[PDB]
Amino acid sequence: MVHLTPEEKSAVTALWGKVNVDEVGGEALGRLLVVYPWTQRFFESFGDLSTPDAVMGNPKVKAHGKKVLGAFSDGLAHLDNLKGTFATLSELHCDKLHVDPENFRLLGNVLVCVLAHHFGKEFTPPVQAAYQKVVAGVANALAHKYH
């Protein structure tokens, strides 16, 4: 990850305050599963993922999305120390879940698309740029303990 200017930080915090974390969480996880179906490989226990509608309405997907974006959300308070903040989670994802870190990058890009769809014209080019840095930062932090 790169440089968040206090301005670029502020632009991040400000928009985030308007986010419904549970709602955006479900949407981003569902869209990941629809747009890049190979990511469904970890979720066969979630039931029916047969169609976009089934994915988007699956309660297990929504519940997992909430958990994932809640951790993301908490990370936004520690932009200064993402690696420290995500260390244990990094370890877990590698050692126990076997999740290819490429999935974190895919999620990051889907998240950006979600925010754009949610915020419209308020998601300006400079705001996107700031969030790009954050999503890459988080992905890097989560992949940091892989071995």
Partner 1 sequence: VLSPADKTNVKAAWGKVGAHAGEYGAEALERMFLSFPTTKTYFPHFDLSHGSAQVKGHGKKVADALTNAVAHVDDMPNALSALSDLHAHKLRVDPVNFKLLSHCLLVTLAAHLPAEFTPAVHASLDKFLASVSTVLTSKYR
14 binds, among partner 1, ligand HEM, none (CB under 5 to 8 A by kind): none
DSSP string for 83-131: HHHHHHHHHHHHHTS---THHHHHHHHHHHHHHHHHHGGGS-HHHHHHH
Binding residues (CB under 6 A) for ligand HEM: these are 39, 42, 67-68, 71-72, 89, 92-93, 97, 99, 103-104, 107, 138, 142
89 binds, among partner 1, ligand HEM, none (CB under 5 to 8 A by kind): ligand HEM
Q: Is 30 exposed, middle or buried (0-12, 13-18, 19+ CB in 10 A)?
A: buried
| Choice between 88 and 146, CB closer to partner 1 | 146
Nearest to 140 by CA among 98, 104, 88: 104
Binding residues (CB under 8 A) for partner 1: these are 30-31, 34-41, 52, 55-56, 94, 98-103, 106, 109, 112-114, 116-117, 119-121, 123, 125-126, 128-129, 132, 143, 146-147
Handedness of CA 9, 12, 14, 80 (dihedral sign): negative
Nearest to 36 by CA among 99, 98, 103, 94: 103
Minimum distance of ligand HEM from residue 18's CB (angstroms): 19
Alpha carbon distance 47, 69 (integer Å)? 21
| Choice between 77 and 146, CB closer to partner 1 | 146
118 is in an annotated binding site: no
9 is in an annotated binding site: no
| Choice between 96 and 121, CB closer to ligand HEM | 96
98 is in an annotated binding site: no
The DSSP output letter for 76 is G
Annotated binding site for heme b, which residues? 64, 93
